[PDB]
Design a protein around this ligand. Structure first.
Ligand SMILES: CCCCCCCCCCCCCCCCCC(=O)OC[C@H](COP(=O)([O-])OCC(O)COP(=O)([O-])OC[C@@H](COC(=O)CCCCCCCCCCCCCCCCC)OC(=O)CCCCCCCCCCCCCCCCC)OC(=O)CCCCCCCCCCCCCCCCC
Ligand SMILES: CCCCCCCCCCCCCCCCCC(=O)OC[C@H](COP(=O)([O-])OCC(O)COP(=O)([O-])OC[C@@H](COC(=O)CCCCCCCCCCCCCCCCC)OC(=O)CCCCCCCCCCCCCCCCC)OC(=O)CCCCCCCCCCCCCCCCC
Ligand SMILES: CCCCCCCCCCCCCCCCC[C@@H](O)O[C@H](CO[C@H](O)CCCCCCCCCCCCCCC)COP(=O)(O)OCC[N+](C)(C)C
Ligand SMILES: CCCCCCCCCCCCCCCCC[C@@H](O)O[C@H](CO[C@H](O)CCCCCCCCCCCCCCC)COP(=O)(O)OCC[N+](C)(C)C
Ligand SMILES: CCCCCCCCCCCCCCCCC[C@@H](O)O[C@H](CO[C@H](O)CCCCCCCCCCCCCCC)COP(=O)(O)OCC[N+](C)(C)C
Ligand SMILES: CCCCCCCC/C=C\CCCCCCCC(=O)OC[C@H](COP(=O)(O)OCCN)OC(=O)CCCCCCC/C=C\CCCCCCCC
Ligand SMILES: CCCCCCCC/C=C\CCCCCCCC(=O)O[C@H](COC(=O)CCCCCCC/C=C/CCCCCCCC)COP(=O)(O)OCCN
Lengths: 115, 122, 171, 347, 105, 83, 98, 175, 71
């Protein structure tokens, strides 16, 4: 309830700032003023054309490495168990597996960007 | 539907329960074992023919190994099959003995008292 | 499926312990040292019967023991206890750590007036034994009679009569 | 692709299948399916080309949809009974969704479109794997829940699979698509007897796997993927064409060959119930599979097609790689009918 | 199909997580621990077919605990009748159902 | 023993970050098995009373169970106060 | 069941329907797959919280892990298709027929 | 009937699902999935699942960032479509909204079996726990039990993640 | 002590609900007052829709979301 009220207050303040910004000043809009900025000359193509991603392979690896973060976050609570030998073996097993995956992708030139 | 998957006392991956040792083993001259040896010999001949070797004479050690392997597997296969059929018969007889109401032995009637319709052929 | 038995509202009345959480936390160690026996009896009844309607008198005895304990504390160590629980109450987490002078004075007061020794660390969490005349319930889960199993396999194994008996095969 | 990486991926495929087969928890079964799919996708693209990429994409989409429905059915079953154990599946809607998801994974009709396409788009080794090893996990799960299965849906899908397999196979000149339609029909036969006896399902699965392995290994031995390229094999290795002809006859179901045994036992089992009409239709329909097997036999073994001049150079060289299990596979595919009572060891 | 490797080797790969009544950490109980315990004990060793009939009472109680359908049905019936009574003006709800109670600890 | 020393020196001269990372990882892997306080941590974890200790019914044949929290029987935490 | 259960099941059905009917972009269908995964996560979490099944609180994390694996697989396949055709349209995957 | 907060959150969840299922454009679809992730985090939070809600929100934020980059790279066109720029997308969106509203009205005013079972409503407060015990979060203890009870799960999950890295490298190799 | 007073509180709420429902539901023909929905005769923990079912929405809100919303 308190967090919902805080979110509502912050969003309302930002929206009111936008409203004041758009309704207080004098507006004089004409076609040249609203045209796209490309350093004074008209753009050749569209900005909606495909834009190549040279680091596409690292982005996919980020998806997999991000989920191992969710596996490692409960570790502070896992340290309170009675069988600390099993938990410590499993925490190191996960981190060693994550370092091996980085070592594999590194050595296969997976971290280099495409040219 | 699985009839024997969950029979009490069944060990998961045994292939040959100790109870099976109470049954007579198949004779080494069992015709089924001879047919398995024939299968192994055929496999050896086909192996010779596929590799473009003299079919009957090329490898005698290979053919012997083929026949021996087929016979060796077939012996244990036959033992397990016979054990399963013995189990089926044992369970059938026990169930019939323990449910007398469902298997009544009704009175025998001779053919001199049973009226059968006669259908002439003409 | 039958009506649910409930105690009457008159059966649920008892003298109430109406001190706040900070007072209880301040007095908790001595309360667990002094009123141990009725509390353990009530907890044993509660965990054996699995039904709150069967351990009401034990709860009343717990209330009476707590009232006697607090009456003694009032009769002998009023002001030190008041200072101690005010100190405990000021904290947002109600921390023992931040008020040791008041706890020491309260402990000295109770030790001299009543001969009360504060339990050591690890003692109140011990598993204890309770001697009670309450009979052990025989069917606390109200279980029905369990169905009888399929009898068993019995006898010696003989070869299948006439073999597999599948179609033409004789073996 | 590195041989070490290939071996690791193959072992991961098999590990997923074994995890499906040995688990008691629905979550572990779903995990086994996920692992199997993840390792299987690159194996389909081992020889990289646009057709292989398209086949892998179609396979991934179909199997991911199937696993999503599988997980939803598991969750519904958990909701109506807090059970994770693989058992009679206490909820009927969950069972229906589970049946549809497993049918999608197997390629049973109506969801049979992907199989011909993926099989034609990949190599013969990938096709061998896809049509033999990839049937084990869904069939095992179906066997474990056979009691709660609804006969009307399973039998409808099985009969549709047999019909569509025959009709689709009638129209093919590509060997991989013929194999895929044959696989669809055999899956239909396997699932038709599942509500009555799972031992018959296992027996049919084993015999089909043996015959399929023999056929695919013969096709790899003589590097033919089209009917016309297989029509040249007589002028290079006639023994291969003769063995292929006999194996094709076995696939058709003609006695005294081993192929006839699963159909015979399934018909007997279905007549042990009432179930008279369904086996009759199933046999009449399997006649279509027999027809296009016979057409392949006509084209490759019983008549001699014209050849080319450059076959003379091929005459001078031998096959380097040798498949050690091909003779045993052929013998098991053909001459195993007299050992039929040995199926008792399967239960 | 199912190779009971766990049963053969005694490994317990996943059986620890199959049921709600099986050794939770810190002995935290499931909401329907007793019902599941009784249903399991009642149906143990008699086979699936027999269990579906002879343990129907325990299973019905367990499902009632799980989803609580009859409970909401009864509560909604009670509330509907109460609302009908108050609408015609023949109930006069007690003071402790309106927030003017005398709370106890 | 002579080529690996040169390899170590070269790695320290070219990739000190990786040398430090591998050394830290190896120490973290092997040290916990050689420490005497691991069992102390296990005992401390086992001594934290998260739930209520349900008492046992007296059958008259348990000398080892205390009848009161302050009795000499039962476990002791005196080892923890000296730590 | 309560209303929230029906709402989550409806979300799952909508995402499945979304996946079944393809428009032009492959990426949209991948998004529908992720939506089904999210719906399953929410449903399983609600069921496990309601019944206080303590050891089952860890299954949805496993579900998320394998969802990430599935999404990575789909994205890799999309990269390959786009490199082949310069577009991720499902109309281009028509080289193989039935 | 208490403030209808959970019902409103689940309705917004369904609305975001309809938003991305109509498939207007990948950029818009990712926005809808982000909104759905947020409301789902809220729904799970209202049931005691703080950790799981926050975790799923974080995971889907990362996934949608990758999806945005991929949409800019490989799934663009000159005029990206919005929910009102196309009769097909608008029709699917309106159909989804009307189906949701029809189901809500159908289950709210009546007590009927839609497909699986019936439902009268009353708000999801009724089936709650009134459980009074603990210095710990039960959800946190359950999730932390992954390192003592879930050894097999940890093994299979770690192996699958390593295999996934190898698999994406193999798939994107090309040649 | 907390356990004892919680038991008394739960029993008191159940008894109040029982008496008020007996007053209310005497109009309908075939309603056994206080009838259980379980075949077993053992104690079952109340569902909190059975303790707060006849009370004002503020009490219901505090009993359901009081701990979750306290930050
Ligand atoms: C039911 C009762 C029991 C019956 C059992 C079942 C039937 C018999 C067993 C079947 C398997 C056994 C043989 C397998 C290997 C054969 C493969 C082969 O190529 O053979 C060639 C080979 C000749 O090669 P070679 O000598 O090295 O030199 C010549 C060149 O190779 C020249 O070779 P090439 O390659 O240059 O020539 C090309 C030729 C080469 O193509 C072939 O040779 C075709 C062979 C295919 C093998 C069959 C497939 C697998 C088995 C399934 C059988 C199913 C039977 C059920 C009914 C269905 C009918 C199909 O291809 C063609 O010409 C195309 C013609 C198209 C016709 C299509 C018909 C083919 C299918 C017919 C199968 C019938 C059954 C087997 C027939 C016998 C085969 C030898 O034949 C042999 O010499 C071996 C056969 C004799 C071995 C057994 C003798 C035992 C020892 C004697 C003592 C007996 C002991 C008695 C005890 C008591 C004490 C005294
Ligand atoms: C070296 C030869 C040697 O040492 O043989 C000793 C061995 C000693 O056996 P025995 O107990 O003195 O002979 C009993 C009689 O043969 C009387 O035999 P039995 O009454 O013990 O028969 C055993 C039984 C079981 O036998 C079998 O299942 C395999 C028999 C071979 C089947 C024939 C096709 C392959 C040629 O045979 C059957 O059930 C007949 C069904 C066979 C048809 C299977 C379905 C396919 C039909 C054709 C397509 O005799 C033989 O092996 C004769 C050659 C076979
Ligand atoms: C920091 C955040 C919190 C701050 C708290 C205050 C927030 C203020 C709200 C945000 C808006 C601030 C902008 C202030 C400037 C006024 C803009 C607008 O509202 O005025 C005109 C609104 O008027 C409309 O044009 C028409 C007139 C009124 C419409 C009739 C509607 C019926 C109302 C009944 C009126 C009868 C009497 C009212 C008293 C009861 C728009 O004129 P327009 O030129 O376009 O816009 C440019 C304004 N210029 C000229 C200053 C540059
Ligand atoms: C086309 C011909 C088919 C041939 C098929 C392959 C033949 C060679 C393969 C060799 C098999 C090796 C396995 C035996 C090693 C020990 C493993 C053993 O422990 O497994 C047992 C199982 O035993 C095997 O199943 C026996 C395999 C024998 C198969 C041959 C029968 C084929 C039918 C008749 C055709 C003639 C065959 C001739 C062969 C040359 C475990 O039993 P169980 O865990 O409780 O059952 C699990 C499944 N349930 C519960 C659902 C029932
Ligand atoms: C026969 C062929 C063998 C080789 C092939 C093996 C294939 C599978 C890979 C690993 C084998 C799995 C066996 C281990 C199962 C885990 C459970 C068992 O070991 O007990 C655990 C013991 O844990 C031990 O630490 C053993 C696990 C050590 C794992 C080492 C890593 C091996 C994985 C390598 C292969 C996996 C894929 C490759 C990735 C590297 C828990 O013991 P404990 O906690 O007391 O009791 C729990 C019950 N409580 C909660 C009531 C207390
Ligand atoms: C985020 C922190 C800051 C938040 C923003 C708060 C800013 C408050 C400062 C108030 C300063 C007063 C605003 C003056 C600028 C108004 C716009 C302007 O200058 O336009 C001049 C414009 C020109 O009109 P014409 O001559 O008729 O047409 C010529 C074109 N053909 O003249 C006007 O329109 C004047 C109208 C008065 C604007 C209202 C100002 C009142 C104060 C509002 C403050 C808003 C706070 C809420
Ligand atoms: C034993 C426990 C292990 C777990 C702990 C470690 C945690 C995680 C650490 C590993 C993460 C992944 C490792 C990454 C491997 C990198 C592979 C590589 O290619 O290396 C080269 C660099 O070459 C090297 O391999 C560096 C030297 C060899 C490896 C580094 C040292 C290895 C171990 C040495 C110390 C061992 C322990 C310390 C003992 C200290 C002695 C007293 C990278 O440089 P480039 O980017 O390619 O440059 C391109 C621009 N021209």
């Amino acid at each position: 309830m308190n967090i919902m009220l805080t979110l509502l207050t912050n969003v309302t303040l930002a929206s009111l700032l936008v409203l004041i910004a758009f309704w207080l000043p004098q507006l004089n809009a004409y076609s040249e003023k609203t045209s796209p900025y490309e350093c004074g000359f008209d753009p050749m193509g569209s900005a909606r054309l495909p834009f190549s991603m040279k680091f596409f392979l690292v982005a996919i690896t980020f998806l997999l490495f991000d989920l191992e973060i969710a596996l490692l976050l409960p570790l502070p609570w896992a340290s309170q168990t009675n069988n600390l030998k099993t938990m410590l073996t499993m925490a190191l097993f996960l981190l060693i597996l994550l370092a091996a995956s980085l070592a594999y992708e590194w050595t296969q030139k997976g971290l280099e960007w495409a040219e | 539907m699985t009839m024997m998957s969950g029979r009490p006392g069944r060990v998961p991956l045994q292939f040959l329960p100790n109870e099976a040792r109470s049954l007579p083993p198949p004779k080494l001259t069992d015709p089924r074992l001879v047919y398995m040896g024939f299968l192994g010999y055929c496999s050896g001949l086909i192996d010779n023919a596929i590799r473009r070797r003299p079919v009957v004479s090329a490898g005698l050690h290979r053919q012997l190994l083929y026949v021996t392997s087929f016979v060796f597997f077939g012996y244990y296969l036959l033992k397990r099959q016979d054990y399963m059929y013995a189990l089926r018969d044992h369970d059938m007889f026990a169930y019939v003995k323990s449910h007398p109401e469902d298997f009544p032995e009704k009175d025998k009637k001779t053919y001199g008292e049973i009226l059968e319709e006669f259908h002439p052929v003409r | 499926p039958g009506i649910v038995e409930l105690p009457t509202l008159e059966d649920l009345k008892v003298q109430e312990v109406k001190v706040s959480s900070s007072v209880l936390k301040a007095a908790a160690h001595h309360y667990g040292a002094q009123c141990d026996k009725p509390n353990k009896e009530f907890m044993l009844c509660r965990w054996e019967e699995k039904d709150p309607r069967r351990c009401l008198e034990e709860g009343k005895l717990v209330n009476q023991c707590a009232l006697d304990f607090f009456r003694q504390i009032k009769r002998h160590c009023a002001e030190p206890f008041t200072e101690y629980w005010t100190c405990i109450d000021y904290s947002g987490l109600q921390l023992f750590r931040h008020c040791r002078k008041q706890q020491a004075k309260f402990d000295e007061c109770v030790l001299d007036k009543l001969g009360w020794v504060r339990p050591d660390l690890g003692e109140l969490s011990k598993v204890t034994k309770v001697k009670t005349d309450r009979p052990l319930p025989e069917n606390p889960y109200h279980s029905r009679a369990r169905p009888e199993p399929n009898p068993e396999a019995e006898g010696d194994l003989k070869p299948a009569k006439h073999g597999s008996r599948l179609f033409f095969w004789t073996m | 692709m590195n041989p070490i990486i290939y071996t690791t991926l193959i072992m991961t495929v098999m590990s997923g299948t074994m995890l499906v087969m040995i688990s008691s928890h629905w979550l572990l079964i779903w995990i086994g399916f996920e692992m199997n799919l993840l390792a299987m996708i690159p194996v389909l693209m081992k020889n990289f080309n646009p057709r292989a990429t398209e086949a892998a994409t179609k396979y991934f989409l179909t199997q991911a949809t199937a696993s999503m429905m599988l997980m939803m059915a598991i969750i519904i079953n958990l909701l109506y009974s807090g059970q994770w154990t693989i058992t009679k599946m206490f909820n009927p809607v969950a069972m229906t969704m589970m049946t549809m998801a497993l049918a999608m994974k197997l390629g049973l009709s109506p969801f049979h479109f992907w199989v011909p396409e993926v099989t034609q788009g990949i190599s013969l080794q990938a096709g061998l794997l896809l049509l033999t090893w990839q049937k084990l996990a869904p069939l095992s799960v179906l066997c474990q829940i056979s009691q709660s299965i609804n006969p009307n849906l399973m039998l409808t899908m099985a009969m549709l699979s047999i019909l569509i397999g025959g009709w689709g196979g009638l129209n093919q000149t590509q060997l991989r698509k013929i194999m895929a339609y044959s696989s669809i029909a055999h899956m239909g036969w396997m699932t038709a007897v599942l509500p009555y006896n799972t031992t018959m399902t296992i027996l049919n699965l084993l015999i089909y796997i043996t015959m399929t392995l023999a056929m695919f290994m013969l096709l790899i031995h003589s590097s033919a993927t089209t009917t016309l390229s297989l029509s040249h094999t007589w002028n290079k290795m006639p023994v291969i064409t003769s063995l292929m002809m006999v194996t094709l006859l076995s696939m058709g179901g003609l006695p005294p060959l081993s192929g006839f045994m699963p159909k015979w036992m399934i018909i007997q089992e279905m007549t042990k119930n009432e179930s008279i009409i369904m086996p009759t239709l199933m046999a009449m329909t399997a006649l279509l599979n027999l027809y296009f097997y016979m057409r392949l036999a006509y084209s490759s073994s019983l008549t001699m097609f014209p050849s080319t001049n450059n076959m003379k150079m091929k005459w001078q060289f031998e096959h380097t790689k040798q498949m050690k299990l091909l003779p045993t596979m052929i013998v098991l595919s053909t001459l195993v009918l007299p050992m039929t009572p040995a199926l008792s060891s399967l239960n | 199909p199912f190779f009971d490797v766990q049963k053969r080797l005694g490994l317990d790969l996943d059986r620890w997580m199959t049921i709600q009544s099986a050794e939770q950490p810190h002995k935290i109980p499931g909401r329907c621990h007793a019902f599941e315990k009784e249903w399991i004990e009642c149906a143990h060793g008699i086979g699936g077919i027999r269990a579906e009939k002879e343990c129907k009472i325990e299973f019905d109680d367990f499902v009632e605990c799980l989803l609580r359908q009859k409970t909401m049905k009864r509560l909604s019936a009670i509330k509907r009748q109460r609302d009908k009574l108050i609408k015609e003006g023949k109930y006069t709800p007690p003071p402790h159902h309106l927030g003017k109670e005398d709370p106890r600890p | 023993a002579g080529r690996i020393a040169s390899f170590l020196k070269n790695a320290w001269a070219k990739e000190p970050v990786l040398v430090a990372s591998f050394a830290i990882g190896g120490l973290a892997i092997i040290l916990p098995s050689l420490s005497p306080y691991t069992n102390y941590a296990i005992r401390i974890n086992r001594a934290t009373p998260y739930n209520y200790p349900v008492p046992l019914r007296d059958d008259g044949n348990m000398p080892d169970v205390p009848s009161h929290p302050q009795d000499p029987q039962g476990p002791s935490l005196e080892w923890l106060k000296n730590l | 069941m309560p209303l929230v259960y029906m709402n989550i099941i409806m979300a799952f059905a909508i995402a499945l329907a979304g996946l079944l009917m393809y428009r032009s972009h492959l990426m949209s269908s991948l998004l529908c797959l992720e939506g089904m995964m999210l719906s399953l996560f929410i449903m399983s979490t609600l069921i496990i919280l309601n019944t206080h099944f303590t050891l089952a609180n860890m299954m949805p994390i496993i579900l998320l892990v394998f969802a990430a694996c599935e999404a990575a697989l789909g994205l890799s396949l999309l990269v390959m298709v786009s490199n082949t055709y310069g577009t991720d349209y499902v109309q281009n995957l028509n080289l193989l027929q039935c | 009937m208490t403030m209808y907060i959970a019902f409103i959150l689940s309705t917004i969840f369904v609305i975001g699902f309809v938003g991305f299922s109509s498939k207007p454009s990948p950029i818009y679809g990712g926005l809808g999935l982000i909104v759905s992730g947020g409301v789902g985090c809220g729904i799970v939070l209202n049931f005691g699942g703080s950790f799981l809600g926050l975790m799923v929100f974080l995971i889907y934020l990362g996934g949608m960032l990758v999806v945005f980059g991929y949409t800019t790279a490989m799934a663009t066109e000159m005029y990206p479509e919005v929910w009102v720029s196309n009769k097909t997308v608008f029709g699917a969106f309106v159909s989804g909204l009307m189906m949701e509203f029809c189901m809500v009205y159908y289950a709210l005013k009546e007590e009927e079996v839609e497909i699986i079972f019936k439902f009268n409503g009353l708000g999801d407060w009724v089936i709650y726990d009134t459980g009074d015990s603990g210095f710990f979060s039960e959800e946190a203890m359950g999730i932390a039990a992954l390192y003592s009870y879930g050894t097999w799960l940890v093994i299979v999950t770690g192996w699958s993640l390593l295999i996934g890295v190898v698999v994406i490298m193999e798939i994107t190799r090309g040649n | 002590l907390f356990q004892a007073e919680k038991d008394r509180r739960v029993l008191q709420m159940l008894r109040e609900n029982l008496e008020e429902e007996a007053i209310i539901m005497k109009d309908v023909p075939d309603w056994k007052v206080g009838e259980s929905v379980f075949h077993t005769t053992r104690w079952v923990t109340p569902m909190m829709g059975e303790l707060y079912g006849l009370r004002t929405n503020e009490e219901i809100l505090s009993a359901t979301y009081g701990f979750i919303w306290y930050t």
